A paper describes a structure:
Cryptochromes (CRYs) are evolutionarily conserved photoreceptors that regulate numerous developmental networks including de-etiolation, photoperiodic control of flowering, root growth, plant height, organ size, stomatal opening, and stress responses. The CCE domain plays role in the regulation of CRYs by interacting with constitutive photomorphogenesis 1 (COP1) ubiquitin ligase as part of light signaling pathway.
Following extensive crystallization trials under full spectrum light conditions, we successfully determined the crystal structure of Arabidopsis CRY2-PHR in a tetrameric state (denoted AtCRY2-PHRtetamer). AtCRY2-PHRtetramer is comprised of four monomeric units (A, B, C, D) that are arranged as a ring-like structure with a central hollow cavity. The architecture within tetrameric AtCRY2-PHR is comprised of two different interfaces: a head to tail (H–T interface, monomers A–B) and head to head (H–H interface, monomers A–D) interaction between the monomers. In the AtCRY2-PHRtetramer, the interface (H–T) is assembled by the residues from α6, α12, α13, α18, α19, 310, L-24, L-26 and the second interface (H–H) is formed by the residues from α2, α10, α7, and L-11. The co-factor, FAD, adopts a typical U-shaped conformation and is buried inside the central core of C-terminal α domain, similar to the conformation reported in other structures of cryptochromes and photolysases. In the AtCRY2-PHRtetramer this connecting loop has two defined helices (α5 and α6) but it is largely disordered. Specifically, within AtCRY2-PHRtetramer H–T interface, the residue R208 (monomer A) forms ionic interactions with E428 (monomer B).
Author numbering:
A (entry chain B), C (entry chain A): 5 to 182, 188 to 306, 314 to 485
B (entry chain C): 5 to 182, 188 to 307, 314 to 486
D (entry chain D): 5 to 182, 188 to 306, 314 to 486
The structure:
């Protein structure tokens, strides 16, 4: 047999069912079709493309040792490149993994019909998901918009398997079509600025496996009390690796459940909730693929926004005057990642405080986030605008005085990303516009020149939001 | 559908095909039927029974945290106990894993025939092996008889898979049948002495996975450089955990295979070589079940006039033979229930070629003392030492303890730990004090014949008493 | 014998000559006279006073466990308080250590003259200093105007022992006089802002002993290669404890000297150089007291200034547009300490770029430095203004491009204290105004809104100095 | 000036009063005069001489790094070698540190008189003790009888200090006196066996400052609860280093003293008690040189012994059937060191259970111990003998069933030095003879085959000694 594997966002060799199907039957021809025209509005952002350039290099380096290597093709049409690979490789079967974004859903089915009619067999295995969105029903069949009612039933009867990495790898003697090597992801006018994200990130499937041993045996023990704290990479940093499919979610769920069974047996209650807080976070990634599968284009709510370009640039540069918002936008753009509670605040500020279009705030998240996912990002904005009964309503404006006192105690997250407020005490570190002048100047801050004043008064933004509902 | 899971030597949940097959179809019913009379001359030993008692107690607490308890059963007939569990729970399928011991080889295929007549569904799975002995074929007849030619063909193709542990399980209902209250595995007079085995061993599958993680990440880096030595944690110390099936062979194999792949793209020239020896070490266990399958007795039927000396037999157990590697090996074997591989090639070659003692005498001692008392490994180990297999050693091959210790134990640090009386004896004579001059022996406070015993047998006599005893 | 141990800036118990001589004689009455009126402009600043309140509280409970409590007195005249402590205790002798500042020099000699005439014996010992300035002279009595010829001579002689803390203690047990528990150091208008210095500093003498045992066996090995690094606290962080006398320099020298002898015969060509740069640095504290002794006020090289108050606020708040200067002024305000290389840059920028009075720059250093030392700070400004033969010429300015490449490699000091310059490459991390406009957006740095433009051009400031000399 | 330094038992530089004073006055000419014929009975043993050789070359290496060598001299008369060094060097003052052995007490003072009559300046400093034995005066004239009352007197003054190492060194011109390159400390027959002491000891003043800092900062907080134990590094292993004067007694005292002050205000509870035991442990060394100073050569009893040469070989090589005694003898000979609580067990077993002459035990402890202190080893045997008031009477001995139940619980100390008793339960581990026959067959213990039977009954030693105490 001659099989052609099609890597998309399953950039790994471990537990790859499409790759395990190959190399178990005949020869393998790895290929990566990169068609930017067919991506549409879902084109990968600036930082998301940088992770793709490094992961594909780490992938091609991995496949180069197994026996074959990793063909990259930039084409104007995916089917035009797939049918052209079969021309030079003489393959009789093509295999790939599942992707549930709106562009790949209609493309996986179109690629099927075009070459299955031609006597060439296809097969699409389960990838990046523990449960397919067509494997669960409420007995009846109603969709569980309730994540609580969703994940409560997913914990019942797991029936899958964990695969292996292929020991060997065979490749036919072929030619080339239309081939490329490495271009179309990083712009020369910003490569030096993009080469600085390596300070806190290292793309690759093997580096992802090092992270699992760094988090399971050492950091998952007290994850329930660290995830609440926002200052420190307190969580697992597995979002960029899981999006690009560098870690199989089977492994992320198996070894985490393995720790839960040991802690549930050792009477340990601190680790039990730590495993619950992490496994029920893994289910949210599965919940995002379930909603986006039967609720694509939910969020059909177009109320009078306030398309102010200048007020949007201050939200990107962290000049909104709010400490917890400006620090989050400072962390997002410095490391390409931010905590979940930070995203909740900086996104709510973009729609509830500034009335900017939610698409504008998402297009910036889609561009600068290293973990820029499609199902998870949309799911986060639905949690903000009030599209799920298990999320905060659009009308509420959380007071930063108590909001910072929950996720960022002692104000150590602002004093790390906003060094100008390093002497402002924790009593006013989340809201300098409430402290008297006798303690503001004592802290060294001068609201106006030393630190930006609040861009929008919260007292006037509460009623003005309810003034249009 | 109610399904009875029959635990035997697969005391684990991570990759248990029989346990994963059940608990997914419907209900589950764990049971450990302990029938000592059906196991003949190779009834589980003394220390190995102690390990089994602690693992079963840990297995009981592990399963009770998932959903169902564990039915500990000690009856007079195993098949009678299986038929008793079917009627009390209403089960319809009996599921267990594969075992290749001659006792279970003839009764596992008997339980199937007994239950097919009654209509009870049965299905066996490969639990503690990656290549079953009937899966490797050729185009001719017989196996390979050489491990090099056997393991060369196993590395050609590979189709494995790792199963997941179920987070939920369901008990059946009503009354229980004959139930054993965890009894028989220990004798009242030798219980405090068996508790001393906890100093270097913590049985159970939970500590088994942590050791596999510790060895792969922090010790497989230089396994090829330490496995050839004896001192300290030279190897992985996974034999007692792999014998009772607490870690699946695939989980141990793939962890060193995954680490070997990363040690290739990073051009770790000596890294992937360390995984080659460890994986081939696992292959020796695979090759043990191939010989034991085709040759199902206990290529080893050479019993000639032995020196049935019970006085020289107790001097070999307690480690008082004048040979440091032999004495220190028998000192660690009885104090920790374990010993290095190269030392087992020494203490047993000394038992059959230096003392002319029966090989069944030393093998019965390994059965009671070794926690990793593997039937398939304890047979292949003694066959490799004698001239039974052309895999390595012959019958008329003796090794000088001088070049033997300096090859597997430099600086003599292994003897000084288990023989304090030879602490100030230099490494040049630490492995053979009799060949050292009296000017250094008294300076090293040895004094043969009072503190450390003189060599019980001469190296030249054992060669002249054996070459003239073969015809 | 009833003795009075006048604690001043010797806030320790171990290696205390005046405390040991008074203990091994008879009774001990420790007292601390705090007269802010006798202090001229050398009155302790905001940060330096906070360190005094913590060390004195630690000193109070320290002696409280040995046998005698600590007495703090805030009076109008020090001699009036000393005469009061004598008439309430009957102490026939008053002992103290040495202080070489101009105010405390004429005071100790006035205290001796006023107490000797009353029949009360006085005794002074060497404290907080290896060898006094009146003990180092060649065959000629010429004071060493150069430091290279200074410390090279201090190593050719060594005669000073080290003593242990007193074992026992007892009190003359008599009524007290005017007993000012704790007044003057901290005002309530800035108490919470001052309490935030506990993040990176823990004042006390036992914490100083905790600091040495960590710096010797762990950080002194490669001190020569870490002193060239500005990022982080690469040095020892011993200046605050040495200024307040919380640990004697004899123990600081003896621990580093024996480590050098250990590395001497060990063929350690890297440990000797590390012990050298630390001991040569200890000599700078020794050299500061030498110039402060027979050179009262040289630093009288004044030149016309441009005292711009608005340009002085930007120098404090770090709004000067220079990344290496603003990052240092942020660290000076956040933690009250900065590296020696940073102090050279931020002080030269105040006098050589903005043309601000050197006293104004010192008035801010003296107020915000936890290690605010009179002899060390003046010696620092003498090194910048060009008042030393082996210093820096006042007529020349260093290019921040090559300046950052010398003391801040990899560019990690700006990315920590100025998070807006995170993705700005090292090629322009020290000077964003030289970078092209194409990379100023790739680095997400808009000068008019993100990080302010340089307030004064470098080439103009270099010629403006030559325009008035 | 030019001063000659005489290193004898002060092989250190951190705090050496005779070395730092000689460095300031002028030139430094370090000499190490040995002369075994003047030692006689107090000649260092086999293992103790090995430490002296390794610590000598290491101290000679550290001296040359400063600027002055170390002249090693082996002579027949120590005074003839001192005068030979003065003429070839031209020195004026001869300096050295104090010692408190009967040899040096009459030798150093003889050096003083013969060099004073010739016009050579001499000055001896204190560098081996906190308070010198003549600085303490008690009652009216009885030099105190016990230690618990002696050390209370030392805790009522304390005018100590410490000194710094001198970075400068300069040796004069020509010399070449009657110095040898290597003496006769090691014999070729016992050299490879002596090299096996490096695995447990790294002698020298440089390493001495390492485990000193390691002990005070790490394993001192819980010294009050680990001093009674024996397993592992229970104590500080500072006995051999303080014997050769590689660490100043003031630095050892003032380090644990500084931790007690910090643990006082913080109220560490166990911290103050651990210092109160370690400092009073140093006080026993202070009392060792005190009782040995006023008394010559309280330990002179020649009652009928049992001079059995075969019973001496069993107690020496650890074959007496007593695991707590046999394991100690196998440690004392393997590592050249043993815990203090083991010494009162292996030495009391030799003089009471076996009735062997105590000189046979003291001669063996002098050869195999690296910390062979003349002033301290004698006091240890006096504690075993019925001599010291606060000590063991001659007719007292404890059952090992209670010794291990308090000083060595869990029996992990025996299973390391006696592997043949590993599976023996921790109850009968210190006395296998009293164990039932079922546990002995189960624990592989065959008293008389693999492990030796008790060489002497405990009830016999009590009844045999009663007839001799009349
Ligand atoms: C507005 C908004 C936008 C978001 N955009 C993304 C995105 O683009 N990509 C992304 O991976 N996550 C996104 N999330 C989820 C969340 O920000 C990250 O999953 C998490 O904060 C970082 O992962 P971690 O490994 O550090 O933490 P952990 O909590 O340890 O991550 C657990 C894993 O489970 C999944 N997961 C965790 N939380 C969620 C969630 N809320 N929704 C979906 N899956 C989840 C991810 O695979 C994640 O790696 C978004 C959340 C919000 C509120
Ligand atoms: C006379 C004799 C008797 C032996 N009896 C046993 C026995 O009863 N039980 C037992 O498990 N091993 C036995 N062996 C093999 C060998 O002693 C052990 O495998 C090894 O010493 C312990 O392996 P480890 O887990 O400590 O380390 P590693 O060697 O790192 O473990 C590798 C694993 O592979 C297998 N393995 C490794 N070497 C061999 C080998 N030579 N033969 C077979 N399998 C091997 C084992 O499952 C082992 O756990 C015997 C060898 C000899 C010479
Ligand atoms: C403008 C300016 C102002 C300064 N103001 C002070 C001050 O107020 N207080 C202060 O203690 N030091 C001052 N210094 C000296 C120097 O900044 C600090 O000694 C040092 O940076 C503190 O870090 P450290 O103690 O970890 O350094 P290390 O080098 O690790 O410590 C060496 C020690 O030696 C002394 N020392 C080292 N370098 C110098 C130096 N250049 N001048 C004087 N003493 C030195 C200090 O006691 C210091 O603690 C100043 C230097 C300059 C250029």
């Amino acid at each position: 047999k001659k099989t052609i594997v099609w890597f998309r966002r399953d950039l790994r060799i471990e537990d790859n069912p499409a790759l395990a199907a190959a190399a178990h039957e005949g020869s393998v021809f790895p290929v990566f079709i990169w068609c930017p025209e067919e991506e549409g509005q879902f084109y990968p952002g600036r930082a998301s493309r940088w992770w793709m350039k490094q992961s594909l290099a780490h992938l091609s380096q991995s496949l180069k040792a197994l026996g074959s290597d990793l063909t990259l093709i930039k084409t104007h049409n995916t089917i035009s490149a797939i049918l052209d690979c079969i021309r030079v490789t003489g393959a009789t079967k093509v295999v790939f993994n599942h992707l549930y974004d709106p562009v790949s859903l209609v493309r996986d089915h179109t690629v099927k019909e075009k070459l299955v009619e031609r006597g060439i067999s296809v097969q699409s295995y389960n990838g990046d998901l523990l449960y397919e969105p067509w494997e669960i029903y409420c007995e009846k069949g109603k969709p569980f918009t309730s994540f609580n009612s969703y994940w409560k039933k997913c914990l019942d009867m797991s029936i899958e398997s964990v695969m292996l990495p292929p020991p060997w790898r065979l490749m036919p003697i072929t030619a080339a079509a239309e081939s490329i090597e490495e271009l179309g992801l990083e712009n020369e006018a910003e490569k030096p600025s993009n080469a600085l994200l390596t300070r806190a990130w290292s793309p690759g499937w093997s580096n992802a496996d090092k992270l699992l041993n760094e988090f399971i045996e050492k950091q998952l023990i007290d994850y329930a009390k660290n995830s609440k704290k926002v200052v420190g990479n307190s969580t697992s940093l597995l979002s960029p690796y899981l999006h690009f499919g560098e870690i199989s979610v089977r492994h992320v769920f198996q070894c985490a459940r393995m720790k839960q069974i040991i802690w549930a047996r050792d009477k340990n209650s601190e680790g039990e909730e730590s495993a619950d807080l992490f496994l029920r976070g893994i289910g949210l990634r599965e919940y995002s693929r379930y909603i986006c599968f039967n609720f694509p284009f939910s969020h059909l709510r177009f109320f009078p926004w306030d398309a102010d370009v200048d007020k949007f640039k201050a939200w990107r540069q962290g000049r909104t005057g709010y400490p917890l918002v400006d620090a989050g936008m400072r962390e997002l753009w410095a490391t390409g990642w931010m905590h979940n509670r930070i995203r909740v605040i900086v996104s709510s500020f973009a729609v509830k405080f500034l009335l900017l279009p939610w698409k504008w705030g998402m297009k910036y998240f889609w561009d600068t986030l290293l973990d820029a996912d499609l199902e998870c990002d949309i799911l986060g904005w639905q949690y903000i605008s009030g599209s799920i009964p298990d999320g905060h309503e659009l009308d509420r404006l959380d007071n930063p005085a108590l909001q910072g006192a929950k996720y960022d105690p002692e104000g150590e997250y602002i004093r790390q990303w906003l060094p100008e407020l390093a002497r402002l005490p924790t009593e006013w570190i989340h809201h300098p516009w409430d402290a008297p002048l006798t303690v503001l100047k004592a802290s060294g801050v001068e609201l106006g020149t030393n630190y930006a004043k609040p861009i929008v008064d919260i007292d006037t933004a509460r009623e003005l939001l309810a003034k249009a509902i």
